[PDB]
Design a protein around this ligand. Structure first.
Ligand code: R18
Length: 243
């Protein structure tokens, strides 16, 4: 009741990219649209996270940090879910006005990464993830990447993360054990994907001026300030099982 009531009530609604589907696809136009969509989704991720049960118990500085580190994985996870519920994972449903088909996957120069994300999407089907499990897993996904040196107040974070794990546990509840195993495995699988995208968007930002790919304000900031901390090993994901 209560926990899930909150997660359902705060789930963001549909977000459009504002892409112009009439002009021919192209590396520059597709990625620039994705970046605009990224900026827009970021606004929602922030509002969503701040409304999560117990989130404000975290030190104010830790709050923005965990959101900026988890942003990529969060977007990837929700996207895979939208792709599964809308186009049965046949394509990547980034937004109602920005669906990637085989051709866009290739023209965006993100084919292998898109293949990886499509696999994630398909897993929602293969595992028959319920909407409730999806919401719990997405929440937990927000608390799955932190600085090696710890946050301002690691204790509140560890406590909060532990609670979201217990919540996923209740929703699942020798079948419980098997289900918990496969869902935590799925959650772990998001990280390697998020890392490839972190590397890709970072490289893209550095040469964005040469390829005509625009990066909105807040994203350009996150990719140049928070993402390199992840790429250089200062910030690491928290895996359930050893990789
Ligand atoms: C194109 C790029 O710069 C590299 C990877 C892209 C990511 C891929 C994951 C993603 C999922 C969504 O549903 C919203 C937009 C979205 C992105 C928008 C811009 C990024 C960060």
């Amino acid at each position: 009741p209560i926990f899930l009531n909150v997660l359902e009530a705060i789930e963001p609604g549909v977000v459009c990219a504002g892409h112009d589907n009439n002009q021919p696809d192209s590396f520059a136009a597709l990625l620039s649209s994705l970046n605009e969509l990224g900026e827009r989704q970021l606004v929602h991720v922030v509002k969503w996270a701040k409304a999560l049960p117990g989130f404000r118990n975290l030190h104010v500085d830790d709050q923005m940090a965990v959101i900026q580190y988890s942003w990529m994985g969060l977007m990837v996870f929700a996207m895979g879910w939208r792709s599964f519920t809308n186009v049965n994972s046949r394509m990547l449903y980034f937004a109602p006005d920005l669906v990637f088909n085989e051709y866009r996957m290739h023209k965006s120069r993100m084919y292998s990464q898109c293949v990886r994300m499509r696999h994630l999407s398909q897993e929602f089907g293969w595992l028959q993830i319920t909407p409730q499990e999806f919401l719990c897993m997405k929440a937990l996904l927000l608390f799955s990447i932190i600085p090696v040196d710890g946050l301002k107040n690691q204790k509140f974070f560890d406590e909060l993360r532990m609670n979201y794990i217990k919540e996923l546990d209740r929703i699942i509840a020798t079948s419980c054990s098997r289900r918990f195993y496969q869902l935590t495995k799925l959650l772990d699988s998001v990280q390697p994907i998020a890392r490839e995208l972190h590397q890709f968007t970072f490289d893209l930002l550095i040469k964005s001026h040469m390829v005509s790919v625009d990066f909105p304000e807040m994203m350009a900031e996150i990719i140049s300030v928070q993402v390199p901390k992840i790429l250089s090993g200062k910030v690491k994901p928290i895996y359930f099982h050893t990789q």
